[PDB]
Amino acid sequence: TQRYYVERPIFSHPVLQERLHKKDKISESIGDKLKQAFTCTPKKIRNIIYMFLPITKWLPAYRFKEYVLGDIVSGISTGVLQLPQGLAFAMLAAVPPVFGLYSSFYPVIMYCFFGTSRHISIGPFAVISLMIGGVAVRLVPDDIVIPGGVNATNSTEARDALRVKVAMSVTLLTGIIQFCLGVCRFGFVAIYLTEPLVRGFTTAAAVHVFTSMLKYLFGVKTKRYSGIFSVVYSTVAVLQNVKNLNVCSLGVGLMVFGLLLGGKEFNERFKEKLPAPIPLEFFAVVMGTGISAGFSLHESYNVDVVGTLPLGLLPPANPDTSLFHLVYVDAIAIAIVGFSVTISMAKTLANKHGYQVDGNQELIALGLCNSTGSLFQTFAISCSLSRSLVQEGTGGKTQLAGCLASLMILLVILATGFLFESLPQAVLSAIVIVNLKGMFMQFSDLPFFWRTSKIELTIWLTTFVSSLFLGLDYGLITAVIIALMTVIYRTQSPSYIVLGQLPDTDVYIDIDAYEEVKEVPGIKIFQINAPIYYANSDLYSSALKRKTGVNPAFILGARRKAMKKYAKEKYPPIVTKSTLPEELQRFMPPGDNVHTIILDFTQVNFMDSVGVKTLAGIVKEYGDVGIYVYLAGCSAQVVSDLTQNQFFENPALLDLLFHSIHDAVLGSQVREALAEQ
Amino acid sequence: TQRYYVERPIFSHPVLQERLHKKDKISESIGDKLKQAFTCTPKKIRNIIYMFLPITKWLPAYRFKEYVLGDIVSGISTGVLQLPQGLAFAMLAAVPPVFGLYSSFYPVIMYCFFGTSRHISIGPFAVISLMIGGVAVRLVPDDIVIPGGVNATNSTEARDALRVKVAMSVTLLTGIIQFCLGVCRFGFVAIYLTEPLVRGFTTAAAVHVFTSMLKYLFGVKTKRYSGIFSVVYSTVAVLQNVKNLNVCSLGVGLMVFGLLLGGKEFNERFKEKLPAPIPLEFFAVVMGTGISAGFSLHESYNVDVVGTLPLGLLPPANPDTSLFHLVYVDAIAIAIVGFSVTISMAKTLANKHGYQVDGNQELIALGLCNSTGSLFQTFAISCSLSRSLVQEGTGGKTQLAGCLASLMILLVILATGFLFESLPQAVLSAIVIVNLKGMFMQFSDLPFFWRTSKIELTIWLTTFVSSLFLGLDYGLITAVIIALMTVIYRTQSPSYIVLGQLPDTDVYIDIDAYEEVKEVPGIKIFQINAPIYYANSDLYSSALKRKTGVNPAFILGARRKAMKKYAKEKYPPIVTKSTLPEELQRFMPPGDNVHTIILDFTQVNFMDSVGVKTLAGIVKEYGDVGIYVYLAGCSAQVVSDLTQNQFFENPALLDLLFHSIHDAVLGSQVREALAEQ
């Protein structure tokens, strides 16, 4: 023994209390919890606008070389990546690309004006376009083209306009929902989602996008679904008509994918400055345009392309305020999923470097971005589908990177539409698939969790299967609920243990864990590694009698039958402990004379009324048997709420408390020794 | 100090491990977990049939006087109580009373043959008839009476038969569901419901029944509902047509209620043997029959009565096996609610005396009872609505009480129908209301929980409002989920505390709690009374920096700015702890030189990957600041899963563990003293 000598007396509970006194419990009384605002405090409003507008630190505090170069490179890279991504998302939405461009341009600006994140390429997300198509098919008629008077071979431009309008309304509704959420300071909801939730959910997103791209890789017009086996029905529909349909589409897709792999190899083997300091993909766009125009293989197979790209911009407009009635549940589900994914992405980036991000600010940012896009004839967007990860590699220090990006995209679209008016619906698909595989290759955590624990497997897999098959919103909600159920199970099946004693110490560990530990006569220890709420209550009593081996009802019956077999030849004026009625006869079973029971509570977080009742029953029962029970851990809450419940008649129950396990041990030893008379 | 002298050396973790060795970890390997059955073990099958058929202890082990008298008195009392209850439930079901009698008779018998409970009067439950009417109105047409050819003034006997058939099918489906549940050994679901759940849920049941009786107290034929404000819409419908409708009904109801109160007073003031050792109500039946027949006030107001009571019994029949398709969701909801209420009642009785009840046995009992009643042209039943409580007061020792009861009811119905063929639909209502007030008068736990805790209020009230307004099934499910949410909140907002030291002891308690406790220099203690799962994680770090006052980022910024202001005038070859870069300058803030941080984990039940990551971050961050961190409670699970996660490079991180808080205290003291060189 180098140190740690105590020589302190025995403290059960009352020794403490009589040795102690409460201090004051001073608190902030009524009306003193608001005496900060309601005046012209420049500090208060200054800090409020600081947390609302993070901009107030950017231009005043900016670099000259590193910031500029990082912003430029990151913005150009993100824009070149996301432009085909925007096109693909718009075509998935079955809207002309111009709306995708609007989403890529305006909300980026409203975010650069609003949002505390730094390294994130805010843009449209895929499943968003997925539910866009889901509405466009469910709430929007597909094969009912109302004759306006022209009856074109495809007069669906009116149906497309209806799609635009319904997306407009739903995006506005989602934006206002997000704004209302933000003004209520929701960060609690941000943390309820786990890390495996985010990871598996992104996996399901990737597989859904993969399915959609495979469908739109060849041009088979089938039904779109959003229900049970929705992706399954989509893929079987694609399969049932794939044969001898298009070969130019597959050929161009495979060749562009090979070009993309060659670029992967070129930028991955070496990291230089002259050709490209950043792995890009625009040369694929260049070659696709060249093949379509100069080589002119469109008519060589009569293959199709993106089509026409309306050149110009649009004035603002508001959605019609008489149609939101029926489109309510869809809108709210979309807002829920949009926030879930966005704030998830937000935290999963903010956790990275020496910077933190308050979600509520990002929530109001996204709410305003969606509402404004709706006003600006645009659909709502999300944090990222994979580009934000690209943004990470491109070191987008400040938010000016995304601003300059979106400005570059707007300049390109307005000053040019012809150079890319003729691109197929497969090159963008291959780009999307490249991004998907890039973002999924590391989605092989299954061994990590497998070596880690079962529960991570459970939560991962249930999220994956619920989000993939069922609706992304339904998958999300079920996944969150089942994560909470994982928590309750973890605290439902604890690890009951029976402690021993480390010789000549006050340490107590489970006997099954080691051989060096010993036991103490007449004494049993039962440690619980979980609280006792209503649910995790009675099975605790069962496990107690089980591991301890002392079934007190068995004791009573054995005493009764043994005496039968021998027979053939002043306010609570109550004792909280009986004695042994056995008159010391030779019909005793070979049961050890364990006399006292000790339950560790140092690992008990809280307690509750059902638990109070069951502990009272257990204690009274053992006392009736004539077996002592002692409780270790009389700290604050356990005693507080046990006293709150009608548990004590100021009895020796108080004496049954012990602050230390070993303190209880020695108290019991002393009690037994005194009992020796 | 009387005892408790230790003088034991310093044990962080490795001192333990090098001082210890694991024992064996022997387990039951593959194929040895089933070597009990698959042979002709008379013990195994004997005990199996014991737990399946509790009867094997009743006739062989029976008394001669006490059992007989208790069974007789309990059975007669329960039967006389439940017979009008059965009539009321049938009329609520809008079926002729004969079906209520079938429910009162057959399933009681199948239970007396199956079920380990002793003191319970198994019978029909009200809300069951409520959802019966709900189906009879929703899935069964109400005002569409198909002309069969006779076109009577009320040809609805065919519609009533349709009601009977649909109840028949749904009861069969619920019975088979319960049986399937039972064979899967469900006791987990039994405990997930709390005590306040049961109490508040019964309150809502009582108010619903009260509403129904008030409606059928005067004969206003309105619409029945099962949705939002269902009871509210029912009661407003009743109110909108109540005026000058019936006065004989209210008069007879009030007079019979006064008779019931007089009986209450007579049996409550004294407890004798000659007039009635048990408070009964049959004299109300006698007087109602006398008024209807001899006094003959029916035509005096042209008031109505129960009607005709078909005399006789019925042969068995099975439901049509081509209609269960559409009636699936309703059937499953009914089975869910039936088990919930029944097993709740079962536990709430089994907990009472020296007897325990395994629910799965009761689940298979109820499943077979429902299925058989369906086969025997009968609707399914439940444990009780209030009579079981009567059964308690009547000391129904064994299950023969209910058997003799149901036999008495069958004898009365078959040998007599005329003596009660003419009874109004108000006397039974008053009886039901008497039972309801009897069962609710003690449903004033609100002060009990209010003095107890907030959480009980939350759970009680949410159950009450969800079950009353929304559907009883929906109310149930929402109530259970919100109870689990109460658990997660309780472990989401812990009680962070900062421990001090009891002078010259190793005890450590919160400083805010008492004045006698002191502090230890350069040392801070942060105790958590809740685990660290994914959710309850980052706010923990926040509260740490908050209560401790040591914002390490603040420390870094302060050091940086202070030095700026001074300036104007081999495998993991890594240190897990930095030092102080401050060169001891007079620009230091007046911050205390607290050098080490100690986090109690003795109250930490478990850990998880998100928590692992956040602890790693916190530790690394403080080490970088140059502040030590030590962990108390290196018992089993925390170290186990921290090691499982990529946490240790076999570094001094192991040395950062401590089995005892005070052990960590002294270790830090020693480290600092050694640092003094």
Coordinates of C-alpha atoms in Angstrom, one line a residue, chain B residues 415-599:
Chain B
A415 CA -85.3 -22.3 -16.6
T416 CA -86.6 -18.7 -16.8
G417 CA -87.0 -16.0 -19.3
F418 CA -90.4 -14.6 -18.5
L419 CA -89.6 -13.1 -15.0
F420 CA -87.3 -10.6 -16.6
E421 CA -88.5 -10.3 -20.2
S422 CA -89.9 -6.8 -19.4
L423 CA -87.1 -4.6 -18.0
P424 CA -86.2 -1.2 -19.3
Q425 CA -82.9 0.0 -20.8
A426 CA -82.3 2.2 -17.8
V427 CA -82.1 -0.1 -14.8
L428 CA -79.1 -1.9 -16.3
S429 CA -77.7 1.5 -17.1
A430 CA -77.9 2.6 -13.4
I431 CA -76.3 -0.6 -12.3
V432 CA -73.4 0.0 -14.7
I433 CA -73.1 3.6 -13.5
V434 CA -73.0 2.4 -9.9
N435 CA -70.2 0.0 -10.8
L436 CA -68.4 2.7 -12.7
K437 CA -68.4 5.2 -9.8
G438 CA -67.3 2.4 -7.5
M439 CA -64.4 1.7 -9.7
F440 CA -63.5 5.4 -10.3
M441 CA -63.9 7.0 -6.9
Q442 CA -60.3 5.9 -6.1
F443 CA -59.1 7.1 -9.5
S444 CA -57.9 10.3 -7.9
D445 CA -54.2 9.4 -8.0
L446 CA -53.5 12.9 -9.4
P447 CA -52.3 14.3 -6.0
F448 CA -50.4 11.1 -5.3
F449 CA -48.3 11.5 -8.4
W450 CA -48.3 15.3 -8.1
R451 CA -46.6 14.9 -4.7
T452 CA -44.6 12.0 -6.2
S453 CA -43.2 13.3 -9.5
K454 CA -43.9 15.2 -12.7
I455 CA -43.3 12.2 -15.0
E456 CA -46.2 10.3 -13.5
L457 CA -48.5 13.3 -14.2
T458 CA -47.2 13.4 -17.8
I459 CA -47.8 9.8 -18.5
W460 CA -51.1 9.6 -16.7
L461 CA -52.5 12.7 -18.5
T462 CA -51.3 11.7 -21.9
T463 CA -52.8 8.3 -21.6
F464 CA -56.1 9.7 -20.4
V465 CA -56.4 12.2 -23.2
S466 CA -55.2 9.9 -25.9
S467 CA -57.4 7.0 -24.8
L468 CA -60.5 9.2 -24.2
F469 CA -60.5 11.2 -27.4
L470 CA -58.7 9.0 -29.9
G471 CA -59.5 5.4 -30.4
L472 CA -59.0 3.1 -27.4
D473 CA -56.5 1.1 -29.5
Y474 CA -54.8 4.2 -30.9
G475 CA -54.8 5.7 -27.4
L476 CA -53.2 2.6 -26.1
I477 CA -50.4 2.4 -28.6
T478 CA -49.7 6.1 -28.4
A479 CA -49.7 5.8 -24.6
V480 CA -47.2 3.0 -24.6
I481 CA -44.9 4.8 -27.0
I482 CA -45.1 8.0 -25.0
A483 CA -44.2 6.0 -21.8
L484 CA -41.1 4.8 -23.6
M485 CA -40.4 8.4 -24.5
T486 CA -40.8 9.4 -20.9
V487 CA -38.1 6.9 -20.1
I488 CA -35.8 8.3 -22.8
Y489 CA -36.4 11.8 -21.6
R490 CA -35.6 10.8 -18.0
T491 CA -32.3 9.6 -19.3
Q492 CA -32.1 12.6 -21.6
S493 CA -32.1 15.3 -19.0
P494 CA -30.0 13.9 -16.2
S495 CA -29.0 15.7 -13.0
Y496 CA -25.4 16.8 -13.7
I497 CA -23.7 17.4 -10.4
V498 CA -20.2 18.6 -9.2
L499 CA -18.9 16.6 -6.3
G500 CA -16.9 17.9 -3.4
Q501 CA -15.1 16.0 -0.7
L502 CA -16.2 15.2 2.9
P503 CA -13.2 16.3 4.9
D504 CA -10.7 13.6 5.8
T505 CA -12.8 11.0 4.1
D506 CA -13.0 9.4 0.7
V507 CA -16.6 10.4 0.3
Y508 CA -17.6 12.8 -2.5
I509 CA -20.9 14.6 -2.7
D510 CA -22.2 17.6 -4.7
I511 CA -21.0 20.9 -3.2
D512 CA -24.3 22.6 -3.9
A513 CA -26.1 20.1 -1.8
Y514 CA -24.2 20.9 1.5
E515 CA -21.9 23.3 3.1
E516 CA -19.8 20.9 5.2
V517 CA -18.3 19.4 2.0
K518 CA -15.2 21.0 0.7
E519 CA -13.2 21.1 -2.5
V520 CA -9.8 19.8 -3.6
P521 CA -7.3 22.1 -5.3
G522 CA -6.6 21.8 -9.0
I523 CA -9.2 19.1 -9.3
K524 CA -12.8 19.0 -10.5
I525 CA -15.4 16.3 -10.3
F526 CA -18.2 15.8 -12.8
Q527 CA -20.7 13.1 -12.0
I528 CA -23.4 11.9 -14.4
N529 CA -26.5 10.1 -13.3
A530 CA -27.4 8.7 -16.7
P531 CA -25.6 6.7 -19.4
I532 CA -24.1 8.1 -22.5
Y533 CA -26.0 6.7 -25.5
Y534 CA -26.0 8.4 -28.9
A535 CA -28.7 10.9 -28.0
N536 CA -27.7 11.9 -24.5
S537 CA -24.1 12.6 -25.6
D538 CA -23.1 16.1 -26.8
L539 CA -25.3 18.0 -24.3
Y540 CA -23.3 16.1 -21.8
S541 CA -20.1 17.7 -23.0
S542 CA -21.8 21.0 -23.0
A543 CA -23.0 20.6 -19.4
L544 CA -19.5 19.5 -18.5
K545 CA -17.8 22.6 -19.7
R546 CA -20.7 24.6 -18.2
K547 CA -20.9 23.3 -14.6
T548 CA -17.1 22.9 -14.5
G549 CA -16.6 26.4 -15.9
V550 CA -13.6 25.3 -17.9
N551 CA -14.3 26.1 -21.5
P552 CA -11.1 24.7 -23.1
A553 CA -11.7 26.6 -26.3
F554 CA -12.0 29.7 -24.2
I555 CA -8.7 28.7 -22.6
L556 CA -7.1 28.4 -26.0
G557 CA -8.4 31.7 -27.2
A558 CA -7.4 33.4 -24.0
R559 CA -3.9 32.1 -24.2
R560 CA -3.6 33.1 -27.9
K561 CA -4.8 36.7 -27.3
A562 CA -2.8 37.1 -24.1
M563 CA 0.4 36.1 -25.9
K564 CA -0.6 38.4 -28.8
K565 CA -0.9 41.2 -26.3
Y566 CA 2.4 40.4 -24.6
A567 CA 4.0 40.3 -28.1
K568 CA 3.4 44.1 -28.7
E569 CA 5.8 44.9 -25.9
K570 CA 7.5 3.8 -31.7
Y571 CA 4.2 2.4 -33.1
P572 CA 1.9 5.1 -31.8
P573 CA 4.7 7.6 -31.1
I574 CA 2.2 10.1 -29.8
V575 CA 1.8 11.8 -26.4
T576 CA -1.8 11.5 -25.1
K577 CA -1.3 14.8 -23.1
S578 CA 0.1 18.1 -24.1
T579 CA 1.7 20.7 -21.8
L580 CA 1.1 24.4 -21.2
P581 CA 2.6 26.7 -23.9
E582 CA 2.1 29.7 -21.6
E583 CA 5.5 31.2 -20.6
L584 CA 4.2 32.4 -17.3
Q585 CA 3.2 36.0 -18.2
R586 CA 1.2 38.6 -16.4
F587 CA -1.5 38.6 -19.0
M588 CA -3.1 35.4 -17.7
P589 CA -6.8 35.7 -16.9
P590 CA -7.7 35.2 -13.2
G591 CA -8.6 31.6 -13.9
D592 CA -7.8 28.9 -11.4
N593 CA -5.0 26.5 -12.2
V594 CA -7.3 23.5 -12.2
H595 CA -5.1 20.8 -13.8
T596 CA -7.1 17.6 -13.8
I597 CA -10.6 16.5 -14.6
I598 CA -12.4 13.5 -13.0
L599 CA -15.6 12.0 -14.5

